[PDB]
């Protein structure tokens, strides 16, 4: 196999600011007849991949060029010359020097942008779940930077761990922020055997947890 | 206007197989190589052969001799891949993709097919609707939303007021839990507006062949 390496993830990088996304090939991509085998692609959620260089240097149609590519024959480079929110995603390199031809892993391309607290909203189960046998309580943790965060939950007061799955958005293409949502699923059995229910949000913006509950009463 | 248009999802059993299509125009279609590329849930992408349909010639990815096959129809301008003995490892979307030239590169893209290896049958989701309970939620803004539990495989298209609801809306991703997939989405409007101005959830679940709307109602 001729091995791509790349990292999977690469520095936040500030809106308007250069990137740089590097490759590294286990053996030369330069043909006999002078073509370095070398692609970058983009690939943003729930997209088909977007071609931005094709051998090594040369600008897609289609592509902006604020895109560029370099390298010797070993080492390549994308570069980005002014970053904008809307290039989140993951890059890839590729060859078709030799069969196999081959991908790169993909580095993820995120933006850094100022710190904001998360918008925290909870609700109870619907009657309809209930009706099931089934409470399922969610908070949702909406439009929040960084990225890191921390989410609790506590019933009648007390720490939960059991029952909980949390689920977070890519980073959004328009405002660079993230989201997270976090689930307590319980036995109806369970959930009218206590009264407070409570989802405590922990980051960075501000040393005090944000807290929002319902009493099922 | 070149386009390539890929058939649709499929769910199937392991041990069979499934043959994918990718419908091109707006070229001539004998002129141009065709790829295909794999890519698993979660996953990057694997490279699986190209095929020129002047030819008919094609380039294989050994790693898959006795798995996949590329075939193309001249009359109907559609290339093919079948994918035999399935296994779960075999889950993923494919793609199919164009070389716009001599070693230039994949220019125009299809959609992708979603391609499911599972003996798990196919379950509709359920649909609970997300209300403010006890805590006057903020004032400004309201955030409301949507539960979608237990469906089976993926995946669901949820939307608010039909697509007309698009701004602050967060669909969160999928997680699978006891064969089963759960997901949720929240809608933020501004407070005024609700339930003056009605907001309801809309899931698609095009493998049951089923559809669920939810008034949020306080």
């Known amino acids: 196999d001729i091995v791509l390496t790349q990292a999977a993830f690469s520095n936040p990088v500030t809106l308007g600011a250069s990137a740089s996304i590097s490759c590294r090939s286990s053996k030369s991509l330069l043909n006999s007849n002078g073509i370095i085998h070398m692609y970058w692609y983009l690939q943003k959620p729930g997209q088909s991949p977007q071609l931005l260089i094709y051998?090594?240097?040369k600008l897609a149609s289609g592509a902006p060029d604020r895109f560029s590519g370099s390298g010797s024959g070993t080492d390549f480079t994308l570069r980005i010359s002014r970053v904008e929110a809307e290039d989140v995603g993951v890059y890839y390199c590729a060859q078709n020097l030799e069969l196999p031809y081959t991908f790169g892993g993909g580095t993820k391309l995120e933006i850094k942008r100022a710190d904001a607290a998360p918008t925290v909203s909870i609700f109870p189960p619907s009657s309809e779940q209930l009706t099931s046998g089934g409470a399922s309580v969610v908070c949702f943790l909406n439009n929040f930077y960084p990225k890191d965060i921390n989410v609790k939950w506590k019933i009648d007061g007390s720490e939960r761990q059991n029952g909980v799955l949390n689920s977070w958005t890519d980073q959004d293409t328009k405002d660079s922020t993230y989201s997270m949502s976090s689930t307590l699923t319980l036995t109806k059995d369970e959930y009218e055997r206590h009264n407070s229910y409570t989802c405590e949000a922990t980051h960075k913006t501000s040393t005090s947890p944000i807290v929002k509950s319902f009493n099922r009463n | 206007e070149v386009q390539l248009e890929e058939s649709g999802p499929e769910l199937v059993r392991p041990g069979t197989s499934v043959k994918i299509s990718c419908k091109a125009s707006?070229?001539?279609?004998?002129?141009?190589?065709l790829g295909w590329v794999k890519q698993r849930p979660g996953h990057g992408f694997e490279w699986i052969g190209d095929?020129?349909?002047?030819?008919?010639?094609?380039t294989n990815n050994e790693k898959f001799r006795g798995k996949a096959i590329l075939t193309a129809d001249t009359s109907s301008s559609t290339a093919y891949m079948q994918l035999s003995s399935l296994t779960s490892e075999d889950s993923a979307v494919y793609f199919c993709a164009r070389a716009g030239g001599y070693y230039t590169g994949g220019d125009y893209w299809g959609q992708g097919t979603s391609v499911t290896v599972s003996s798990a049958k196919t379950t509709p989701p359920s649909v609970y609707p997300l209300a403010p309970g006890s805590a006057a939620q903020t004032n400004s803004m309201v955030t409301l939303g949507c539960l979608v539990k237990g469906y089976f495989p993926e995946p669901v298209t949820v939307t608010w007021n039909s697509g007309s609801l698009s701004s602050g809306v967060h669909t969160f991703p999928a997680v699978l839990q006891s064969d089963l997939y759960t997901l949720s989405s929240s809608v933020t409007v501004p407070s005024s507006t609700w339930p003056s101005e009605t907001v309801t959830c809309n899931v698609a679940h095009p493998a049951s062949s089923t559809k669920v709307d939810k008034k949020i109602v306080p």
């Open positions: 095929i020129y349909p002047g030819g008919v010639y094609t």
């Open positions: 707006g070229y001539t279609f004998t002129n141009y190589w």
């Open positions: 051998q090594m240097s």
